[PDB]
mmCIF file with all atom_site columns, C-alpha atoms in Angstrom:
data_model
loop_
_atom_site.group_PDB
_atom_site.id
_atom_site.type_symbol
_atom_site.label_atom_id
_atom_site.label_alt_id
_atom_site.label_comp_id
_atom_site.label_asym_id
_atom_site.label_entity_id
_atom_site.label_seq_id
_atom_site.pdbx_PDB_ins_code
_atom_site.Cartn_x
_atom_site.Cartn_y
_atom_site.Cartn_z
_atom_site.occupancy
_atom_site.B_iso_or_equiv
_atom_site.pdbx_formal_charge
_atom_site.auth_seq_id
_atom_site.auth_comp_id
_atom_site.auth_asym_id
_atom_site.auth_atom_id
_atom_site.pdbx_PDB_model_num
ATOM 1  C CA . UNK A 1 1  ? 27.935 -119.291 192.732 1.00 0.00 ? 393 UNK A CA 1
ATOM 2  C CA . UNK A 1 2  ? 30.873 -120.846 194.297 1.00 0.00 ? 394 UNK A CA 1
ATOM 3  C CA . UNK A 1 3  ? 29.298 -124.242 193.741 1.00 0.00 ? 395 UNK A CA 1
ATOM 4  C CA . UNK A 1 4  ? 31.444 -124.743 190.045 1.00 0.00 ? 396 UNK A CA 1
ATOM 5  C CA . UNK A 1 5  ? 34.457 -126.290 189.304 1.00 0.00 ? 397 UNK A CA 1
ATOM 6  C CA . UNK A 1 6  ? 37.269 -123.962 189.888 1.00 0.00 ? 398 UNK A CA 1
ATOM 7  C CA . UNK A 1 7  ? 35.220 -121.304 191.441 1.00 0.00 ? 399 UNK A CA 1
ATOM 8  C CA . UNK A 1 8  ? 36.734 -120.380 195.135 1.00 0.00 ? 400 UNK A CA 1
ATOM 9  C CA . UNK A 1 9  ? 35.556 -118.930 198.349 1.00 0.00 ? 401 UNK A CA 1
ATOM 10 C CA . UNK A 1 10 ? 35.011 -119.371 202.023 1.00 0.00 ? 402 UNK A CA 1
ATOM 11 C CA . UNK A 1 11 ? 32.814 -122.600 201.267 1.00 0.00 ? 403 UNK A CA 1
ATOM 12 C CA . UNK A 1 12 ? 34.550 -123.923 197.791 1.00 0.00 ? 404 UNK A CA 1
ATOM 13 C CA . UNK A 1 13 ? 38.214 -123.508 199.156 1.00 0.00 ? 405 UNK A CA 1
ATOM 14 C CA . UNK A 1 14 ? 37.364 -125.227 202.347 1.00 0.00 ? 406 UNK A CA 1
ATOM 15 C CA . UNK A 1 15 ? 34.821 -127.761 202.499 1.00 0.00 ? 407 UNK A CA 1
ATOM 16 C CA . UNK A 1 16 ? 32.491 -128.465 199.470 1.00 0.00 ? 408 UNK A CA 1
ATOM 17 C CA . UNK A 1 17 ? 35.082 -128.383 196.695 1.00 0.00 ? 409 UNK A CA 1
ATOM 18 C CA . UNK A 1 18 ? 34.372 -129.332 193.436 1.00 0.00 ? 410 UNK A CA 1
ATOM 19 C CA . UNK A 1 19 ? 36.465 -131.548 190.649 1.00 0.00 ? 411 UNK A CA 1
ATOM 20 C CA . UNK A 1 20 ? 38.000 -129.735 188.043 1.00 0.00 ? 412 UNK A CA 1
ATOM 21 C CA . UNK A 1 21 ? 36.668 -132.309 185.605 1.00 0.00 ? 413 UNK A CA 1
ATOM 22 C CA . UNK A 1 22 ? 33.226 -132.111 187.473 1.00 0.00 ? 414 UNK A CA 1
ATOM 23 C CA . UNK A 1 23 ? 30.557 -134.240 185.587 1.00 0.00 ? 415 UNK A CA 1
ATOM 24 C CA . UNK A 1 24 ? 27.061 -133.475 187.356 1.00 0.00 ? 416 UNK A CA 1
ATOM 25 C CA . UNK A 1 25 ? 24.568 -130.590 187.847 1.00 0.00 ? 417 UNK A CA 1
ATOM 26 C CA . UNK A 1 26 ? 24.220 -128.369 190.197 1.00 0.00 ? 418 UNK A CA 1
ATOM 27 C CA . UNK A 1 27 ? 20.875 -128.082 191.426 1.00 0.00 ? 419 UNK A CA 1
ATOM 28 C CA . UNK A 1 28 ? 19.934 -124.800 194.011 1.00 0.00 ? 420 UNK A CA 1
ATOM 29 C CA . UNK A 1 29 ? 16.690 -122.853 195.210 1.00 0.00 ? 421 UNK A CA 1
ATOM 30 C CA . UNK A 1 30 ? 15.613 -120.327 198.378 1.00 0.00 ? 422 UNK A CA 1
ATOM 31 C CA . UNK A 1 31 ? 14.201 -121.884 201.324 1.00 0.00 ? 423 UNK A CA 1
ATOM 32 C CA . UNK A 1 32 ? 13.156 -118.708 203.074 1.00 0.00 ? 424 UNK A CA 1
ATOM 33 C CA . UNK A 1 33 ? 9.574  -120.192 203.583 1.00 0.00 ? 425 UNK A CA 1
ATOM 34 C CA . UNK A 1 34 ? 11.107 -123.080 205.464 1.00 0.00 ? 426 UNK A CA 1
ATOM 35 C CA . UNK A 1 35 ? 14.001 -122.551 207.388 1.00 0.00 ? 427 UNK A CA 1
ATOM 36 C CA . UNK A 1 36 ? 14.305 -119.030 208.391 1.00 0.00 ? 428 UNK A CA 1
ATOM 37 C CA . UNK A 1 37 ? 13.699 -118.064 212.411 1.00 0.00 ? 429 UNK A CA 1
ATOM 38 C CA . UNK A 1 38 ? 17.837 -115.567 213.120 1.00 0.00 ? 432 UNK A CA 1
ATOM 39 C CA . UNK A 1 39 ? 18.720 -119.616 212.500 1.00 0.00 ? 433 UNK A CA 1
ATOM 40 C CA . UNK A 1 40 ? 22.160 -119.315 214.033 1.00 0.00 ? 434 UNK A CA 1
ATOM 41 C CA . UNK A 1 41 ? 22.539 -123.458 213.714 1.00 0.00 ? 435 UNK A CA 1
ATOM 42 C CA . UNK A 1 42 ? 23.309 -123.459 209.538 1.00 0.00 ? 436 UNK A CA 1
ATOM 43 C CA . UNK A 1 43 ? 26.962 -123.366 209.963 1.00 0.00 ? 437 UNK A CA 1
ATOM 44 C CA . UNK A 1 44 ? 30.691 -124.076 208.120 1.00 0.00 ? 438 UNK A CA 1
ATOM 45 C CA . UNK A 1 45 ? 34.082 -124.848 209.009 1.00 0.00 ? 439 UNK A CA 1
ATOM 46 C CA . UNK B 2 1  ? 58.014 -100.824 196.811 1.00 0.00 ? 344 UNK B CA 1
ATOM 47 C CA . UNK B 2 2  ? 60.987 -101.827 199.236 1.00 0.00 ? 345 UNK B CA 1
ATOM 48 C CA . UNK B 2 3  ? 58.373 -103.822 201.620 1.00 0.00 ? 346 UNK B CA 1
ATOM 49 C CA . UNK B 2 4  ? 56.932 -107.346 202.650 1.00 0.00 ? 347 UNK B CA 1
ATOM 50 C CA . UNK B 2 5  ? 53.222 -107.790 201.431 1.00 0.00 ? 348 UNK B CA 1
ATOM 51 C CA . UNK B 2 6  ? 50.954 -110.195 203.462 1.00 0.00 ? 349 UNK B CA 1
ATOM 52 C CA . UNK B 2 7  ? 48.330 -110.739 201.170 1.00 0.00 ? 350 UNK B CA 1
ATOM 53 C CA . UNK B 2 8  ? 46.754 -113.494 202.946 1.00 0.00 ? 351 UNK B CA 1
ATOM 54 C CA . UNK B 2 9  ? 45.990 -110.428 206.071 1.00 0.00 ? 352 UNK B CA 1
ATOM 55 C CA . UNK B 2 10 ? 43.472 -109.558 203.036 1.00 0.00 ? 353 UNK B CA 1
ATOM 56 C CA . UNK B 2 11 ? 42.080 -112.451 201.639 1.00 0.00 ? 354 UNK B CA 1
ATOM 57 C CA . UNK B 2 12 ? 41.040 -114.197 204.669 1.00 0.00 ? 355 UNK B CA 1
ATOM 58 C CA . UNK B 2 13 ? 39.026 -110.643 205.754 1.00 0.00 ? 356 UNK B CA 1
ATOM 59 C CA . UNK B 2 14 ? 35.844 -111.473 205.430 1.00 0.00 ? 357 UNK B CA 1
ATOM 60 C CA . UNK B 2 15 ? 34.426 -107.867 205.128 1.00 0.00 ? 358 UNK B CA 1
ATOM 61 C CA . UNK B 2 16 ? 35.650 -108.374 201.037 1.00 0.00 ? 359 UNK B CA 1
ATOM 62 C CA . UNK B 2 17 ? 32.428 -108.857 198.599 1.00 0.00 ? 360 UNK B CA 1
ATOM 63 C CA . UNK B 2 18 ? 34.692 -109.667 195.740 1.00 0.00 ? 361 UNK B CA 1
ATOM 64 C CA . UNK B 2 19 ? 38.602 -110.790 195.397 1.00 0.00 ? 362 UNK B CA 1
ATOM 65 C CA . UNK B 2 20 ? 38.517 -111.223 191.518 1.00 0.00 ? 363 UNK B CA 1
ATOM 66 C CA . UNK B 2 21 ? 42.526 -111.795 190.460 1.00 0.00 ? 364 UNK B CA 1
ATOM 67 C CA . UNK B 2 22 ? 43.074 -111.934 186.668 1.00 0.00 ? 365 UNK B CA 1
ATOM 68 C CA . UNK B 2 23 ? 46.747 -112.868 186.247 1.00 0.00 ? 366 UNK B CA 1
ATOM 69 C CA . UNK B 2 24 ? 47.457 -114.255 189.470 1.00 0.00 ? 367 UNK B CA 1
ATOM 70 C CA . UNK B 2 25 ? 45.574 -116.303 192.184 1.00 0.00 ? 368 UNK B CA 1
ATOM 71 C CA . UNK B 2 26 ? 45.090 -115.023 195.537 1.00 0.00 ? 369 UNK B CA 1
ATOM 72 C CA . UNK B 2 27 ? 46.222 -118.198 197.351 1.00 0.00 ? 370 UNK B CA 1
ATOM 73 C CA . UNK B 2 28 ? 49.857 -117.739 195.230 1.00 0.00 ? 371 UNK B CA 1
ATOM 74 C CA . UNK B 2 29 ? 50.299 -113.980 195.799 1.00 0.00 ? 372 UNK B CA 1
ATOM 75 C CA . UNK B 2 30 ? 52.927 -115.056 198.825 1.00 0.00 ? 373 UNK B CA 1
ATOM 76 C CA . UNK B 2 31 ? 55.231 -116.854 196.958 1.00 0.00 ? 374 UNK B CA 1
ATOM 77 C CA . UNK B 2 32 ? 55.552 -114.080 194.706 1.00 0.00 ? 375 UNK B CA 1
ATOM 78 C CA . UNK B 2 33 ? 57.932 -110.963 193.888 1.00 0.00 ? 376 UNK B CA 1
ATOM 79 C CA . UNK B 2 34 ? 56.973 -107.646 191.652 1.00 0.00 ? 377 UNK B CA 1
ATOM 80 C CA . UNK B 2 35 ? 58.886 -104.727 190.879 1.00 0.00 ? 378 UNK B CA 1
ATOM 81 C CA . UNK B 2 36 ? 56.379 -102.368 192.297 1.00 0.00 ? 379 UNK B CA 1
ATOM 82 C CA . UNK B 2 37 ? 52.456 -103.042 193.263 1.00 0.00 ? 380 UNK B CA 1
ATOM 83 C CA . UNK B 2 38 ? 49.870 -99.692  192.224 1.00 0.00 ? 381 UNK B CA 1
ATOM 84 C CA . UNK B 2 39 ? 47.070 -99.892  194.684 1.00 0.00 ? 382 UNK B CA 1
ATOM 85 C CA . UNK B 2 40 ? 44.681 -97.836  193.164 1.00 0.00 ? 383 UNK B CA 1
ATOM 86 C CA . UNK B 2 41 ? 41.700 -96.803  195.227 1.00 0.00 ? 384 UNK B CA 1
ATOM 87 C CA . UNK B 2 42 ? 38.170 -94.822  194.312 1.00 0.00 ? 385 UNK B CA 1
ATOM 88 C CA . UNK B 2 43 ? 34.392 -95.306  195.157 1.00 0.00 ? 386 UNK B CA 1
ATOM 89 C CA . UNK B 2 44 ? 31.674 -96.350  192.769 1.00 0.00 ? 387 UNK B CA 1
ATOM 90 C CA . UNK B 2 45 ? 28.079 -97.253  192.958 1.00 0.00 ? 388 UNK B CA 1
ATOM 91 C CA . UNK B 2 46 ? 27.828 -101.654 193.660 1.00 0.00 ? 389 UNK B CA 1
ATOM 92 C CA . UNK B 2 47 ? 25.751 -101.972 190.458 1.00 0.00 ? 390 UNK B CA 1
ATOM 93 C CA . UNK B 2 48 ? 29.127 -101.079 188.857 1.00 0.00 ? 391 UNK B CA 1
ATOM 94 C CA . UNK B 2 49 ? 31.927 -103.217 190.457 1.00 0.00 ? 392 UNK B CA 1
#
């Protein structure tokens, strides 16, 4: 959910920021069955 | 009233589920002056925020 243009948070204020003007789609499932352990190496500045 | 209010000691804590600022944004609220502030505080169930 912070993955919109003009939406904020400890990921969207930081790193991954979108354009305001953002032409594009967002595209986002669970991966649970794949990449769960806990796995401590998924990680942000 | 008649203080200084950090309010960037409570939007960096991470411990906050929501921040959600209707008039203001919480990355301005330091270069900002009010007359008075009203913290109003209660508990609720989190199917109601």
């Amino acid at each position: 959910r912070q993955i919109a243009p003009g939406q904020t948070g400890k990921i969207a204020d930081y790193n991954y920021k979108l354009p305001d003007d953002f032409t594009g789609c967002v595209i986002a499932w669970n991966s649970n069955n794949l990449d769960s352990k806990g796995n401590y190496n998924y990680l942000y500045r | 009233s008649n203080c200084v209010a950090d309010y960037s000691v409570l939007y960096n804590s991470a411990s906050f589920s929501t921040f959600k600022c209707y008039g203001v944004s919480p990355t301005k609220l330091n270069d900002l002056c009010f007359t008075n502030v009203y913290a109003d505080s209660f508990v609720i169930r989190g199917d109601e925020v």
